[PDB]
């Protein structure tokens, strides 16, 4: 059996703060 | 058969001798520091 992942399963790639940016 | 081989270290052996080796590997990451040099902090 399956379902759609939608936009799930994303995580902070590194322990660095960033803001107002499209990394 | 299995891939294991054994040495035969004798005191009469210089590349023929046993060598002790340690590798210090350093974890550079943006996580919290936990291993540090003895250099003292300021205010």
Q: DSSP code of A13?
A: S
Partners of A16 on chain B (C-beta within 8 Å) are 30
Distance from CA of B31 to the nearest CA of A (A): 6
**DSSP per-residue string spanning chain A:** -----TT-----SSS----S---
CA–CA distance, B28 with B35 (Å, rounded to integer): 11
Q: Which residues 3-22 on chain A approach chain B with CB closer than 8 angstroms? A: 14-16
Q: What is the resolution of this structure in A?
A: 3.1
Whether residue A15 contacts residue B31, with contact meaning beta carbons closer than 8 Å, is answered with yes
Taken in order B25, B30, B34, B39, the sign of the CA dihedral is positive
Residue bearing tokens 């023929």: B16
CA–CA distance, A12 with A18 (Å, rounded to integer): 10
Contacts of B30 (CB under 8 A, 6+ apart): A14, A15, A16
């Amino acid at each position: 059996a399956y379902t759609n992942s939608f936009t799930r399963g994303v995580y902070y790639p590194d322990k660095v703060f960033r803001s107002s940016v499209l990394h | 058969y299995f891939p294991l081989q054994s040495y035969g270290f004798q005191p009469t052996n210089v590349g023929y001798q046993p060598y002790r080796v340690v590798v210090l590997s350093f974890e550079l990451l943006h996580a919290p520091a936990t291993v540090c040099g003895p250099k003292k902090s300021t205010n």
